[PDB]
Each structure stands twice: as C-alpha cells, then as structure tokens.
Amino acid sequence: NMASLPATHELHIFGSINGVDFDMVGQGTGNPNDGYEELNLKSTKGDLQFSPWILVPHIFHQYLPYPDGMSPFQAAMVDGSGYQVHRTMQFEDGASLTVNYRYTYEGSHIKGEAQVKGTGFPADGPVMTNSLTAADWCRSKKTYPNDKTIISTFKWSYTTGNGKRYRSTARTTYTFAKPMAANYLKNQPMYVFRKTELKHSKTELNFKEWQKAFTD
Numbered sequence: 001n002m003a004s005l006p007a008t009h010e011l012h013i014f015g016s017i018n019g020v021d022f023d024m025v026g027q028g029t030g031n032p033n034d035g036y037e038e039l040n041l042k043s044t045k046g047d048l049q050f051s052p053w054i055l056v057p058h059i060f061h062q063y064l065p066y067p068d069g070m071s072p073f074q075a076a077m078v079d080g081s082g083y084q085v086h087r088t089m090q091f092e093d094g095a096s097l098t099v100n101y102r103y104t105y106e107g108s109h110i111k112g113e114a115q116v117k118g119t120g121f122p123a124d125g126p127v128m129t130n131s132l133t134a135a136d137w138c139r140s141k142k143t144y145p146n147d148k149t150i151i152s153t154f155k156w157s158y159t160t161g162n163g164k165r166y167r168s169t170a171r172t173t174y175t176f177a178k179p180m181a182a183n184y185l186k187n188q189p190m191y192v193f194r195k196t197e198l199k200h201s202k203t204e205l206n207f208k209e210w211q212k213a214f215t216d
C-alpha cells in the first residue's frame, strides 16, 4: 500500500467564529509511516479577527499509522471507501465549536473540506483577543461502538500570553462507508498522543502535527 497511502494534501477550511465568516485554503504534506503533517493556509477573506489557534487541532488521520499496520483511516483511504468526520468542542467559558469534514482522494493526494461553526466566545476572552500562544500535548481515546463508527474523546488545553490555560473537551465521530476490519474492533480502546505547532500572521499560518498511537 506504500503508493496508495497519502503523501500530500490540501485543506479548505471555512465557516464562522461568533457569526463572522472566514475562509482559508492551502497545501500540505505528511508522512503516513510516522504521523507527521505540515500545512500552510492563507485567508481568502482578509485578516482573521480571532486567534488562528482556534483552528487547531481541526486543521487528516489518513497520516496516522497504527502500531501493527494501517489505521482504519488509512485502510478506508487506500480502498477508496472513505469516512466522514464530525467534531464538537465545548469550552470552559461556555463556547462551542463544531466542524464537519469531507475528503476526496487523487492517488496519494488528499483534498479536505472542513466546515466550522464557533459560537459564544466572550469578546474580552483569549480567542477573540488573539491571546492564545501554544497547545498542550493531548491524549485521545478511540472506541468502536459498531463496525462503521469510531468515537474519539479528549481534553484540550491552550496556553495564553498571560500564562493561563484555556481548556475544552472534545468528542469526534467517524462514520465509515464499509465495515472496519475485525482486528480494530477487538483491539480497543486505542490511544493517541499528539502535539501541534502553529506559527501565524493575520492572513497566513504554518501548522505541524505529530501523532503516535498506542494500546498497553
């Protein structure tokens, strides 16, 4: 499957944060043997009026291998059957952010479409005042309640400029067109440690992600 696993990708991520529209597009690459991703995005609607960190972690688990071979995400890309994704994040200050994903594949190139709705961020808070500066390591837990569904949960924390943490909880649901292989369903839960990096201006960002799946 080396030729059918992903090597390059692009993302169109769009929607609104507090009812204000944004839209970004750009190109990336990654390594499906070790989880790595890197992505450049540029705004198509002018300066971003909120912290670009709010788009992290949302800005391609097709790059995630499992400990003993392909992940289900990889398997579903390689056989063309695919999957869809929905995530909800609920923040300590009562805000929410939803995102849904659809993908298409052209050989080893992935095209992603991510539709975002962020609601209820306080005007004064670190999102709307562009005061987020980093994100903690994050441990995700994946369970498989049936042969076509993965549920992933995690707690998330950003660091802010004034040394506070800004916390949220997330639940992600994956819907597979074809049943997942039996070994995945037997070997649950699966955990994944990830780390993200972001450098940004008001119009452009450079993102990186590292991922490592494990049981015990």
Ligand SMILES: [Cl-]
Pocket (backbone or CB within 6 Å): 140, 152, 172
């Ligand atoms: Cl996830």
